[PDB]
Structure formats: C-alpha cells, structure tokens
Design an enzyme around this catalytic site. Structure first.
Site, PDB file in Angstrom:
ATOM      1  N   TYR B 346       0.857  -1.187   0.000  1.00  0.00           N
ATOM      2  CA  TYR B 346       0.000   0.000   0.000  1.00  0.00           C
ATOM      3  C   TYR B 346       0.891   1.235   0.000  1.00  0.00           C
ATOM      4  O   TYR B 346       0.598   2.215  -0.673  1.00  0.00           O
ATOM      5  CB  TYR B 346      -0.872   0.037   1.247  1.00  0.00           C
ATOM      6  CG  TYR B 346      -2.211  -0.713   1.147  1.00  0.00           C
ATOM      7  CD1 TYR B 346      -3.052  -0.572   0.035  1.00  0.00           C
ATOM      8  CD2 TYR B 346      -2.635  -1.525   2.180  1.00  0.00           C
ATOM      9  CE1 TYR B 346      -4.283  -1.245  -0.037  1.00  0.00           C
ATOM     10  CE2 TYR B 346      -3.859  -2.207   2.120  1.00  0.00           C
ATOM     11  CZ  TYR B 346      -4.675  -2.058   1.015  1.00  0.00           C
ATOM     12  OH  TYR B 346      -5.881  -2.735   0.971  1.00  0.00           O
ATOM     13  N   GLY B 463     -13.087   0.068   2.397  1.00  0.00           N
ATOM     14  CA  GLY B 463     -13.286   1.393   3.078  1.00  0.00           C
ATOM     15  C   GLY B 463     -12.271   2.403   2.575  1.00  0.00           C
TER      16      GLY B 463
END
Ligand SMILES: C[C@@H](OP(=O)(O)O)[C@H](NC(=O)CCCCCCS)C(=O)O
Ligand SMILES: C[C@@H](OP(=O)(O)O)[C@H](NC(=O)CCCCCCS)C(=O)O
Ligand SMILES: O=S(=O)(O)CCS
Ligand SMILES: [Cl-]
Lengths: 431, 578, 278, 431
Positions: B346, B463
């Site tokens: 990420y 999310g």
C-alpha cells in the site's frame, strides 16, 4: 418553512408547524430528552452485591483475594435507594428521582438538574458519590473496608480515567472520551439506543436523530444559514415530516428493493417541485438542479433512511445498513446528477462503516457504532439514526446485539415516556 | 508514459517482467512457488523458523507457509526505488526488514525545537544577568555534554555510554546573521549554508527563512534513538526540559534549584517549545511527537528536496511521498493502528517502479500546459472550476490509461487502492503546478476518485473512499471539524483518521503546491531548518535511495543498537562458529 | 428511472444491468446442488441451520416497519446469513464491482453487497443467497474466464491474463479443457468438492467488448473522454455541487466566484493516444 | 450553622446567614458566576486580522506562504460583532451579549445560556462557529478562501484536539483536557483568575474558591455529611465568614511572620471553643481535639490563606506560597496535635508545588497552576485560592505573570461585576 408531523403509522400528529418549533434549542421535548439523557443512571445492585462478595471489584479479569465482604445491598435495597435519593435532592419537590426495579435487583438514579452547574458528567458523579456513601452508611461498613466500596462503585477510577467498570451506567460517556467539544450527546452506542426504544425502528431513528442534531448544534455546526439545513433534515428524516419517510417505506415494503425507494423519492422530489431539469445530455439523460438545495438534502436523507428500513426489514437483520446507505447515496446521485445526503459525507461514512463491519481492523456490527465513533462521526447528523433503525430491525442475527450488550438499558430506561415515544413528545411540544 | 525515462515507469517495468511493458499476457503456476528468484527471502525465512522452534521450551511452531498461504503461484516481482536504479526484494520493504525506514521515523520522533530568546529574557528580567555570544557558546557546550545523559551539577551521578547515545546533540539556528557569526561555529545550524538555493538568485530560500524567523534564536535538540525506542514521543519535550534546565543552572551560575529554575521549566516545556505533533483523542490514545498528530506540512518540511532541487516541484512531491507512505501507512496505519503483515505495498506502490513518479511529472506538464506555461499562475481571478475540471479530467484520463494500456503497471499496482491513490496524486500534481496553491489540490483529489469509480467500475478496498467521498464537501468547508487548510491536516482530521493510500499522496501534493509556488517551506520554517541538519543519521534529501540501501542490507546509519553491552541475542546460542 | 448518464454502449450496459425490467441473458444453467457445492456453506441435501426461530412462531417487537415490510423467505425461516463473492478481471469483465452493487440493490430484496477492487461480496439469508448465486453465475454477468467465484485469496483482477485468456487464480479453483470449457475443481474458498462443476466456455473478445460495463482505453475498449464526454460531464457536476454545498449548503452554483459556466467544459484536451500504447 | 459575611475591608455584609445559603447549588450569585465562566469568550480582532494577513493561521512557529489575505476585520468590527450577535441569539431578549472593546480591537462574546444543551464547551464552539461565518459573510470571503478563515478562528483543530491556537479565549478549557468528570471549573489558570479580578488578592481568592467548590460538588465529593465541610471551607476561607480571615491578615500585617498568623488562628480557635484540650503530655504539651472537626478544618484553612497573604504581601512576591502553605499546615499540626487543612491533602499539594516551582521537572511559578493541574489538584478546594491571592499580591517579580500571560482576560473580563466583586455578589444573593 412549515411541515406537518406524522407518527410511525402514517397518522398526522401536527400541522403547519414552523420549522423552528422542532429546533433542539427551542423544543421543550427535545430539551427534556437531552436533560434525561445526561441525568439518568442505571444500576445493577444484584451484580454489585456479587462484586463485593467475590472481590471482583476492579477491571476485567481482576480479583482481589481476602477482601470479600458480604454487604446485603439487595436486601437493604429500599434503605439504600432512599439514602441515595435524599443525598441527590437539593430541594423538596425538585426533579430528583430514584426507583427500584425487579424486586430491587436494579435501580434507576436521576440526580436533580440543579446539581449540574457546568459539567454534564455530574449525572454520573453525583450518583456514584451518593451510591458509595449510601452503601457504607446503610450497611455499616467500617473505615477499614470503605475503599472496597469505592472500587465496587467507581471501578478502576481514578487510576483508569474510565470509571466504566463501576456500578452506575449512563447512556453518555465521561468527557475525556468525547472526540471533540460538543460531542457529548454523540457518545451513545447504537445498541443502547435500540434497547432503550425497545427495538422499534422509527422511534430509534427519531430518538437518535434528535440527539445527533442537538450535538450538531453543540458542535457549532448550526450557525447562521447552516441551521436551516439541519432543521430540515431533522424534521423530514427524523420526524417523518409530511409523511415522506413512512410513505416511502409503506409503498415499497412488500416487494420493493432499495433502488425502488430511491427512485420513488426522486419522483416525489420532482412532483413536489424540489428538483427540476437543469440540462438534457446527448443520451437523453437529464441533470437536475434544486432552487432549494437544503430541502433537496432533506428529501435525500429521508430516502436514505427509508431505503435502509426497507432492505434491513426484508432481511430482518442489521448488517446491511452501511452498504445500504452507500448505494442509496450513490444511486440518488447517478439518477439526478445532484449531490447525495450531506453532500457526500454520508456516503463517506457508509464506506468506512462498510469496511469496519466486514473486516479485521475494528468496528463491529452496526450496534457498536455511535455518532462519536471515529468511523461514523463524519456525516452532520443524518447517518447514525439509520444504524439504530437497523439494530431495532435486527432479529438477533448478530452476536453483539442490544439483547447481549444493553439489556440493562432496555429494562431501566425503557419505561421513560420521552424515550419510548420521542416523536409524539416532540410533536406535542411543537404545538 | 512520460517522455523521459528518468521519470517514467518503462525501465522498472522492463526490468521487472520478461514480457514487454504493454504485454497483456503472462504465465502462471510454473515458478515452483518460492523456488523462484522472488521467493528467496521466504526460503531464508523457512530456514530460520526451524532454529526458532528448536529454541522454544514446548516447540511452539513459528513461521510456516503451509500453515498459512504459500506464496508464488504468480511471479513474485521485485521493485525499483523511485528515481533510482536500485532494485529490491518485496520482502525487504517491510519496515521490520528495513533499518533505514526505521531510522527515518526515529529521527523525526526524537526531535524537538525550542526558542532561546525567552530564556535570555528571563535571565535579564529576574537576575539582570548578561547574555553574550560567548555565554551562549558556553551554554551550548555544556548542553551537548548534558543532553545525551552527562552530569553537570551533582556528585556520584551515573551517566550514559556515549556510543549508545551518539546521535544526541543540540544546535542553534537564527535569522540574526551577526549573532550566528559571533557564536562558536561548532553549535550552529547555518541557514545561509543549508538554504543557498534560490530561483532568480542565490540564497532566496535563506532570505525567506530568515525573514520568517527574524532575529530569534532557536535550538534543535535531538534525543537518543534508543530513547525513542525504549519509550515514546512524549519523552522528547520533557527530556529537552530537563537537560536545558540543568544547562541553564551551570552556564549561568544559578542556584541549582531556585524559583527561577521553576520558571525555566515552564519556559522549556510549554512557553517556547515547538513539537512535532500533539497528543490524540483517547480512542487512539498516543503521546506527543507520534505520527497521529503530525501535520502533512511538517512531513513535507522534513525533506530537503526543495533546498537541493529548487526547480523540481515533483521530486519534492515524490520525496515527501516516500517519507509519508512509510510513516503514515507502514508504521502508523500498518502498526500503531493495526499490525501484523501490515501495509508494505500500500505504501511502496507510491515510491517504487516510477509509476507515481510517471503520473506526477505528466501531471505537472498538463497543469503547466493549462497555465499557459507559467507555473503557479492560476490564482485569484484566474482560478475557477472550469479550468480545474479541464486539468483534472485530462490528467485523470492520462493516468488511468497507463494502467489499462500497460498492464504490467496494473500488475505491479495490483490493488485498486494504490491505482486510485496514484491517479488522484497525478491530478493533484497537475493542479499544484498550475496554481501554486494547496487547497484546490483537494478539488482534483475528489474529482479524480469519483472519475475513477465512474470510468473503471471499481476503486480501492472496502473502506478506501471514506475521505474521498468527503473530499468535495470538506474541500472548502469552514465547519468545526469538517474544514481546515490542506497543509494543516493529518491523520486526526476525522475522515483521514483510518485509511492507507491517501496520506502518502497528500504529503506530496502539499509539497508540490509550495515548491511550484517558490516557497522554501510548506508549514513550518522552524522544522524546515531543523531537518536540514546534515549530522542526522538518515539522509532526508535522498529518501528512496536510503530505503533502497536499507532493503539490500547495505545501510550503515542505524542508531540505538545495543551490540556494545550484550554477550548474545534471545534465541541465538553463544559459542564460536565452526 | 434514468439509472446513470452516458451516451455509449457501455453506459447502456450499465443501465440495463441496473434495470429490473431488463432480463439478463442466460449463458449457462448450473444445477442448484452444484451451486450449493460451490458455495460450500453446506452440503447439498443438508437442512438449513437456523440462527433464530422462524418469525411466524415468534412475537416480534411492536415495530411499524417490521409491520409493513415483508421478510424474505430466508428471513422468515431464520436462516443463517451466508455470502457469495466474485472477482472481476480488468480485462473486460461483463460487469464491474460497483455496478454489481447497483444491480443487486435495484433487483434484489434484502441483501448486503460490498464493493472492493478485487472482490464483490453479497450477503443474505442462506436460501436467499443460494438463489442469487445461481442467477448471477448463470447469466451474462459471469464470464468463465474474466469472472471468478472466490471467497478468499482473490488476487488477480489486475494481473495479466494467461495464454488462454484466463484470470490468475492462486488457489487454482478452475481447470480448462482443450476446447476452452472451464470447470471448477474446488469450491469457492479452494476446498475439496465431492465432484467437479462445469461452468462452460468463455465469451469471445468481441462479445466481452459488447457486454462490458467498464470504460477502458486499451485493447479496443471505450475511451471515456473521447467517446462519452457525457460520463465525466455529469460526474464532474456531482463533484462541484458537493463542493459548493460543503462550503454553504444553501448556495447555488451561479452565486459562486469562478463557479462552473455550464455542465461540461469547453477546453478538455487529451494526452494519450487511443489504446494508450505509445 | 450560621455565619456573618464580611467584605475585603472587614465590614459586615450580611448577618446570621444560613450555611446552605452560600452553597454553589443554591446561591444565585455562585450560579451566575459559573454561568459567566463557561459562556464568556474574548477575541483579539486585531491579532486575528494580522494572522490572516501574515498567513500565520496555524500553530506555533508555523506560517503558510501564499494564503495571505487582507480581511479588514478590525475596520468592520461593527458589522462582524452584530453578525455574531445575531447568530448567537436564540430568542429576542435572551442573555446573548456581544461587546467591542479598545476601539474594536478586542471583542467580548457570550452565547446565551440557551445554546448550552448539555456540553459547556458550547461557550467556545458557538462563538467560534459564529465568528468564522461572520467573517466569511461580512468580508465577502469566497468559497476558495473559506478554509483559511477556519484556521484563523479554530486554530489547529480538529487535527489538533486543542483549539487553543484559535481566536476565542475562555477561562476554561476543552473537555478532553479536564483531568476527570466534574473538573470543568478547575481548568482555569491562576494567572487568568488573577488578571480577571485585577490583582486584588481577596477577590482573587474568593472567586477562585467559589469555582473550586462548585467543582468539588461536580466531582461528587460533596454527597451526604461530606457536604457540610465544603460549605464551611467556602464560607470561612472563601467568604471571610465572621471576618476571621481579614482579622488574621489585619492583625499580623505590620510585622507578623507566617508563624504569628498560625498561632493567632489557633488561639482564636480555642477562644471560639472550636478546639479544646484532649490530653496533657509529660512535657506539658497539650494535645487538642475538636467536637466539630469540619469546623476546625475550616479554621485551619482560613489560617492558611491568611498566612500566605501576610508572607507574600511582605515580599510582594508570588513565589513563597507553596512553602508557606506547607509550613502553615505543618506548624498548625505541631502546635495542636490536630490534623491540618484538608487532613494532609493541602500539605501534600504544598509539597508537589514547592518542588514544581523550584526545580527543572515541570510546573513553573504559582501563576501557571490551577485546580485541574496534576501538581495542585489534590486538596479538596482549599489550596488553589491561595495561589490566586499570591499572584495578585505579586509585584510582577515573576517572568510568567498575569501581566505577561493574561492581559486579554484582565481587559475583557475585568469589567464583569460578578468577577470584580464575587464576595459582594454572593452575600447579596445569600440575603
Ligand atoms: C476504528 C478504530 O477501531 P475500533 O472500532 O475502536 O476497534 C481504530 N482502528 C483504526 O482505524 C484502524 C486503522 C488501520 C487499519 C485499517 C487500514 S485501511 C482504533 O483502533 O482506534
Ligand atoms: C508536572 C507536569 O509538568 P508540567 O507542569 O505539565 O510541565 C508533568 N511532569 C511530571 O509530573 C514529572 C515527573 C517526573 C520528574 C520528577 C520525578 S520526582 C508532565 O510533564 O506532564
Ligand atoms: O477489507 S478490505 O478487503 O476492503 C481491504 C483491507 S486490506
Ligand atoms: Cl544561553
């Protein structure tokens, strides 16, 4: 601005209500609901008695050997209850109240409004101070033993800032755990609210939106023209203004989908002149605009809540609400080219809550969220009432349900008329 | 891709994959799992696990792919550090496996800035004591003995071993050139020397800083790395308080403990201190000087790129991004706020393969195009939604096309969350270069993300888009917790407080607007100067290069190790090797 | 309803998949028992577990909403809530994650869909989700090469395709025959099944281009800004109206300094070629 | 229980006042005081305008380049002030109040009590939210520039939980920084109180102790028979009941030592029959006892404030207070064999604060402490009033003085009659 107020069965409660009449700043019912919410404690005396007898007087997984004392607090429950009441009283006939429940296994405590000078957390402290002295005096506890009583009642406080392991249970939390100035009335679990309205969805949504909007005022979000948008949201989404909310649910409850509700709401917005053509695109698609954006937002928020109710009630489960709110917002935008509820903030909170109710990282099912929660705090009041609705509708499909986490609130706060029928309370006061 | 391979992704893609960068097909299931090159660390890890199990009293098992998810049915790819030629093993980018990343954050955490002028003012007011450049010079000498844990007053004191704390010392900086000239140069962090960078002439950055700082004297004090590691960030301002306290007593011949000493405490710990960050709301309770309270602009100001490459706003972006990805995503979200395997890729997606690098340079190009070739000209009456929308849609199409047209790029950025992060960063860069303004970068961020979902039919993780759906609204809001200038935001800004794949890019956007705007700092002139200090272990001017050295275990600058005071390590038996 | 904006065939695909009045084409017919095998929450022939008594033999809270909303059959029976999950290739999967949720919440009663880049999950009462799984595996929204049933280890949507056009699956849940036919040889979480489940042949490239809901400026897909300006025109409009509203909710676009002159823009220029490869 | 209330000049203010009449729960003056304390904000408009012009709109050492804007807030002080007033107001005639000062350079803001539903920090947020919309409206700030105005008014909030860098200054702090439930009224720096009463020691002590005891109630320390002792400490120490405090200072003011005051107070205790012989020891030393221990404590607590005033006024310095309190407590114990103020808790706080005002570890001069401060929180109300007196008495001998840290408060709040004259206000209420 004017609205008619309707109840949960589509029956009209009041007409020609000026929008200001349902303002948290002016409505006597709302003001009362707030007052009760910070004042009212619940105590499980049977459990407290058991705490003392076993030395389980600290935090989770703690037990102190050798300090077990047998204090007949349930036996002497009536004496305790009266000692507390007398300590809490500031003057005769004032709003002090203490009631025994379940043969004295449980107790409601409501210190009088006058003991709250500045700090809403007096509702907790007055009760905790009163209860521990009550026990000590009534059960004739000696100096040597007094500290065990403090622990039974105050939990790990002050070593732990959180007296949550103690005996007095409030809907609200201590000031330190509030996420900002004015967040007081946001720090109330959805499961506690759902239990409090005894699992009736519209009352839960209404009660929760009354508290959220009051918090919105307290956060400073309702100054100047910003106010109008919040009062419209409250009236329409929270109080079923002009029967839009009930109507959307009723009309789609048999075989309707979430999308069906959304589209029915767009069509009503059009019919009512809330939105109108702005420009026709090459495909034939029409982008709409709204002369009164705040009113459109009210209509959208109502669509949101109605869509949640329809889908969750179909499943008789709570878990769908976040993903329901997301597609409610997304779809209403794609249908019209206008902005969704709370100008994207509701959709945002639906994304995070979707994530944090289906992943390893935190959150849980909807019943463990609340307006103060970092995951769901983002929308300006319109979001969390959907959660309470969903956990009322849940047929105990979830492990952390109000039945598991909140029985005490259902039992003790459940018979409070302003909590049981919040919309009628408001409508009465707005007359 | 961008026209210049120094900033485009083509060298990385070429060197990662056997096929061409625009290839649409490859081969699976034939790598032998971790038998393949990219499985090398995992084989290393298996060999180690056995020893660990052997050392445990009941043979509790440890690392074991067969008890989890075995790796390498697909190609296990390496990564190229952005704007370098350094290739790395994926496993070697995890912060636990990378001492350079660790040092980068420890350096930030162990820093405190403290004004001196108030202390002089107090000396004058209550004692009428003279302060001269000489007494300031003596003060600094004593402080550099005291700060690491040396005694200045009492008999029979124990003291710290200097090689355990050799990264702790204190310097001063000031906008007062004559004061700086007068003080012993051993104690000076020299603004004219660290900020000789300029745009139309030499020393303009220094000029900006000295004007902002004025004739004030400021101390930058670095605490020992081992102190950050044993404790937390809350120690830092307190430690400065204590040792500055002791130094004052010595250097100014005071009673060692009078009323003036009390006021010096308040001066040091409250009245004139400047911290990295403040504490957190208690759900995510944290001490001072931790990542949760650190604004984006401070992250940016902690890199040196703008002083080292003043005409390259996108290098400034990408260096700030590299620090931010590691700090906010790998450490803060990936550890402080979660833990486990965590969030290496990420983060690393934004500082590897020249993919984000490619998007952002193209972005700046497009933004300049729309600004008529005049950087930072779109302000005031030229600033409107029409030109923004044109810029954003242009660059968003550019970046999202790259992932689609060059599928090796999507394969590297395999999770939608990093594709979104990077396309949006590209759009933000385009607006940063055209405007020289941070806030409108948020408009690009919102539209990019919404345009992404609309174009591709998907975005990031479950999310991912919380803050993204909030972005338009929070853009120019002035409500209580809902609005604030971009530079001042961080992971306590409510909708920013939970998710990876944003704060990395944001650190970049905030830096880009300002470098494009010919600003020598983003948020804090004080922290800008402090982090220029060339005695810091981690090289804040060549971030991705440092990460690359840490990865390949060639890094020589870690501090705070305890090898000097131990005879062995847990789980590793003593005795000579055969 | 309008459903969504857009002038291209990709936009019309979106509108159709969302449109309950639109009947989705059926490509295959997977027997219910094979559906049950694939989901692997229970064995075929095994009776539905209950998490609570059937609603009919129970006194519900006196709730107006429960009163006017009919429960699904799964809800009435007190079924467990289980799930089905799909992974959709970036290489022209017939439907995409977001459009799945649009589709699900328009077409179905009582569902919990979740959208992510490499997985889309739908949760519902067990018998309900079994019915949804069959419909969605049978119809044009499932391609046996560019779509996958995956409840875990989803990696692959953004990974290059193999020689035959199959999306990568680290658990190897599928097997491909010489004639292109795809069979699932493991359940949706990679567990052993008592028998293999034939899904069928993949659609051709041309068909995939025809059926997809994605804009994709590569390999002959639709170039969003060059072929369908309406798409971002309307999305941008939503963006700016959210922007204006966050500042001052009551404000109209015309009252804003530098506000949009109109929907769309006059001077959008593109900086990639069609197909993007250069 | 009855007391006579005397003023700061030893004149009787009211005779035979019932002890309950000076209770923070009952006295309308104490009540208004608390009200004014949480509602009243001060705003330096001049300094604010400079923030926006320099781009110093964030925290310490921070400046944002390129966002400078010229907002003529001080020139339009009139328009802004009225705009804020109209936003703060809930209903016509209510207690909303806004005033301009120093030619419009500074501004006083008081939201009406009616906006405070549950959370006292509405005093802050209502003013902040009103101030930031007022500026945006009156100065015609465009959408693009609005966030800058938020920064200037709200500080680093929300990124920083503390909005202290912001434009609205209260006496009290945000709830998160309170050290516990009920601590609201304790989070008020001694220097702010000292500036507020404009450096008149007795009004400083009284105002401070009114607030401290209000806090004791809200903490829950005043339930049952415990209540009595707190009201006695307030009346004697805080309100110069029976003129004891004054006569102690008056009689020893010329060349009395701290010790002289202690003994004067002891002999007064005997004469009033508060204490009496318990046992003569072999040396001749007599151990005393007290039938009414709570009354004794109230006496020792007045002796403590008296001693502090006499010794600090002698040096005309604030710094001796901690060590004064210490020995007041110690010597009164050694003289009587009775327990000192707050039963050792006050001596406790005297030790920590001695330490933390003469060492490197924390604290500072007496002016930087307050009820909520970890160093000085320990005594139950009697301790911190001594500090306010000391910093009133200080002849600016300390670097961190009210002149330096608190000029805004002295200027804006100094005109409030209830702050300027809290003992008079309270006595007129007790009639
Ligand atoms: C939401 C909250 O969790 P709780 O609901 O309190 O359990 C919060 N977690 C964090 O937001 C997780 C952030 C990092 C992991 C997600 C990366 S996208 C926390 O622990 O304070
Ligand atoms: C008092 C307080 O300091 P401040 O008053 O906030 O500067 C506090 N210090 C600690 O109590 C110091 C304790 C350790 C040093 C003394 C040991 S005897 C703290 O830093 O939070
Ligand atoms: O929960 S998600 O699957 O969206 C991703 C977390 S890595
Ligand atoms: Cl010095």
């Amino acid at each position: 601005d004017e609205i008619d107020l309707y109840d949960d069965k589509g029956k009209k409660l009041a007409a020609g209500v000026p929008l200001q009449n349902i303002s948290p700043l002016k409505n006597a019912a709302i003001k009362k609901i707030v007052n009760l919410t910070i004042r009212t404690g619940a105590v499980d005396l049977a459990g407290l008695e058991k705490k003392f007898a076993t030395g389980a007087i600290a935090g989770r997984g703690m037990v102190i050997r050798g300090v077990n004392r047998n204090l007949p607090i349930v036996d002497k429950a009536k004496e305790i209850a009266k000692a507390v009441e007398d300590m809490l009283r500031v003057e005769s006939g004032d709003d002090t109240n203490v009631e025994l429940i379940a043969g004295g296994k449980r107790m409601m405590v409501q210190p009088p409004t006058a003991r709250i000078l500045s700090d809403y957390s007096v509702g907790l402290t007055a009760s905790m101070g009163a209860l521990t002295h009550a026990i000590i005096d009534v059960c004739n506890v000696s100096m040597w033993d007094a500290p065990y009583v403090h622990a039974g009642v105050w939990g790990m406080y002050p070593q732990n800032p959180d007296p949550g392991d103690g005996a007095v249970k409030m809907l609200v939390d201590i000031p330190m755990k509030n996420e900002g100035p004015g967040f007081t009335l946001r720090n109330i679990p959805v499961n506690h609210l759902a239990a409090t309205v005894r699992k009736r969805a519209m009352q839960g949504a209404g009660l929760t939106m009354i508290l959220e909007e009051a918090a919105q005022f307290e956060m400073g979000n309702c100054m100047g023209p910003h106010e109008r948008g919040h009062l419209l949201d409250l009236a329409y989404e929270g109080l079923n203004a002009n029967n839009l909310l009930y109507s959307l649910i009723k009309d789609n409850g048999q075989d309707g989908s979430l999308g069906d509700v959304i589209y029915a709401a767009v069509e009503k917005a059009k019919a009512d002149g809330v939105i109108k053509s702005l420009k026709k695109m090459p495909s034939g698609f029409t982008v709409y605009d709204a002369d009164d954006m705040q009113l459109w937002n009210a209509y959208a928020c109502t669509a949101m809540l109605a869509g949640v109710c329809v889908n969750c009630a179909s499943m008789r489960a709570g878990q769908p609400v976040p993903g329901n709110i997301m597609q409610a917002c997304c779809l209403i935008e794609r249908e019209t080219g206008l902005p969704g509820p709370d100008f994207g903030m509701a959709q945002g909170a639906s994304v995070s809550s979707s994530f944090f109710s289906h992943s390893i990282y935190g959150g849980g099912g909807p019943g463990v969220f609340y307006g103060n929660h970092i995951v769901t705090r983002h929308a300006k009041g319109q979001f969390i009432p959907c959660f309470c609705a969903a956990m009322c509708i849940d047929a105990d499909t979830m492990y952390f349900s109000p039945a598991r986490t909140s029985a005490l609130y259902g039992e003790v706060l459940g018979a409070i008329p302003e909590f049981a029928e919040p919309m009628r309370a408001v409508a009465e006061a707005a007359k | 891709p961008y026209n210049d391979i120094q900033h485009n992704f083509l060298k990385a893609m070429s060197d990662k994959f056997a096929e061409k960068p625009e290839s649409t097909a490859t081969e699976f299931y034939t790598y032998g799992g971790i038998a393949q090159k990219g499985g090398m660390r995992k084989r290393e890890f298996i060999a180690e696990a056995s020893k660990i199990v052997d050392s445990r009293v009941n043979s509790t098992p440890a690392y074991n792919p067969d008890a989890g998810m075995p790796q390498g049915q697909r190609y296990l790819m390496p990564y190229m550090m952005n704007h370098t030629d350094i290739m790395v093993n994926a496993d070697d980018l995890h912060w636990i496996n990378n001492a350079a990343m660790q040092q980068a954050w420890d350096d930030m955490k162990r820093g405190i800035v403290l004004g001196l002028d108030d202390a002089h003012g107090l000396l004058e007011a209550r004692l009428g004591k003279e302060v001269t450049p000489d007494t300031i010079s003596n003060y600094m000498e004593v402080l550099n003995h005291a700060l690491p844990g040396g005694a200045v007053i009492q008999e029979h004191m124990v003291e710290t071993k200097p090689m355990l704390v050799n990264d702790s010392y204190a310097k001063i900086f000031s906008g007062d050139d004559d004061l700086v000239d007068s003080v012993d140069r051993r104690f000076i962090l020299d603004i004219n020397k660290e900020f000789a960078a300029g745009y139309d002439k030499p020393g303009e950055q220094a000029d900006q800083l000295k004007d902002a700082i004025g004739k004030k004297i400021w101390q930058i004090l670095w605490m020992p790395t081992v102190v950050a590691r044993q404790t937390d960030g809350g120690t830092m301002f307190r430690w400065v308080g204590m040792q500055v306290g002791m130094t004052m007593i010595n250097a100014y011949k005071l009673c060692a403990g009078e009323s003036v000493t009390g006021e010096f405490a308040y001066y040091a710990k409250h009245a004139a201190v400047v911290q990295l960050s403040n504490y957190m709301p208690v759900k995510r309770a944290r001490s001072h000087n931790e990542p949760g309270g650190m604004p984006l602009g401070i992250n940016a100001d902690s890199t040196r790129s703008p002083a080292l490459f003043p005409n390259d706003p996108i290098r400034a972006e990408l260096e700030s991004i590299a620090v931010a990805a590691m700090v906010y995503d790998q450490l803060w979200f990936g550890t402080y706020m979660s833990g486990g395997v965590g969030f290496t890729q990420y983060a690393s997606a934004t500082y590897t393969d020249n993919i984000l690098e490619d998007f952002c340079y193209k972005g700046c190009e497009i933004g300049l195009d729309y600004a008529g070739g005049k950087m930072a000209s779109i302000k005031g009456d030229k600033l409107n939604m029409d030109i923004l929308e044109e810029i954003i849609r242009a660059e968003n199409d550019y970046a999202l096309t790259q992932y689609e047209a060059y599928p090796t790029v999507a394969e590297s950025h395999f999770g939608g969350s990093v594709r979104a992060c990077c396309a949006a960063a590209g759009c933000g860069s385009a607006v940063a270069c055209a405007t020289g303004l941070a806030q409108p970068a948020l408009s690009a961020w919102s539209l990019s993300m919404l345009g992404h979902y609309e174009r591709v039919g998907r975005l990031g993780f479950f999310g991912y888009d919380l803050q993204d759906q909030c972005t338009a609204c929070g853009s120019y809001s002035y409500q209580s917790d809902e609005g604030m200038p971009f530079e001042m935001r961080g992971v306590n800004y409510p909708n920013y407080a939970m998710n990876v794949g944003h704060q990395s890019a944001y650190a970049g956007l905030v830096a880009g607007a300002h470098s494009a705007n010919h600003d020598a700092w983003v948020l804090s002139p004080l922290w800008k100067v402090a982090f220029s200090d060339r005695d810091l272990p981690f090289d804040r001017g060549y971030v991705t290069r440092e990460y690359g050295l840490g990865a390949n275990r060639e890094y020589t600058k870690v501090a705070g190790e305890r090898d000097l005071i131990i005879a062995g390590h847990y789980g590793r038996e003593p005795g000579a090797k055969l | 309803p309008q459903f969504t904006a857009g002038n291209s065939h990709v936009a019309q695909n979106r509108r159709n998949y969302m449109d309950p009045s639109y009947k989705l084409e059926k490509l295959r017919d997977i027997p219910e028992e094979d559906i049950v095998r694939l989901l692997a929450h229970r064995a075929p022939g095994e009776e539905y577990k209950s998490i609570h008594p059937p609603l009919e033999e129970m006194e519900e809270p006196d709730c107006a909403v429960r009163q006017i909303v009919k429960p699904t059959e799964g809800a009435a029976a007190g079924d467990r809530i289980r799930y089905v999950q799909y992974t959709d290739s970036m290489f022209f999967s017939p439907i995409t994650p977001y459009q799945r949720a649009w589709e699900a919440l328009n077409r179905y009663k009582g569902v919990d869909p979740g959208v992510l880049s490499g997985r889309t999950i739908i949760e519902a009462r067990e018998r309900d989700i079994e019915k949804i799984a069959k419909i969605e595996v049978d119809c044009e929204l499932y391609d046996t090469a560019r779509t996958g049933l995956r409840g875990r280890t989803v990696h692959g949507h953004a990974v290059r395709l193999d020689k035959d056009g199959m999306m990568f699956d680290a658990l190897r849940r599928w097997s491909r025959g010489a004639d292109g036919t795809v069979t699932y040889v493991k359940d949706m979480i990679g567990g052993a099944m008592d028998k293999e489940v034939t899904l069928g042949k993949p659609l051709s490239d041309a068909e995939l281009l025809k059926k997809t809901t994605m804009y994709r400026n590569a390999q002959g897909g639709v170039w969003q800004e060059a072929d369908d300006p309406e798409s971002m025109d309307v999305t941008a409009q939503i963006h700016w109206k959210r922007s204006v509203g966050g500042f001052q909710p009551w404000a109209k676009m015309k009252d804003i300094k530098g506000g949009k002159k109109d929907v769309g823009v006059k001077n959008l220029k593109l900086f990639t070629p069609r197909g993007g490869v250069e």
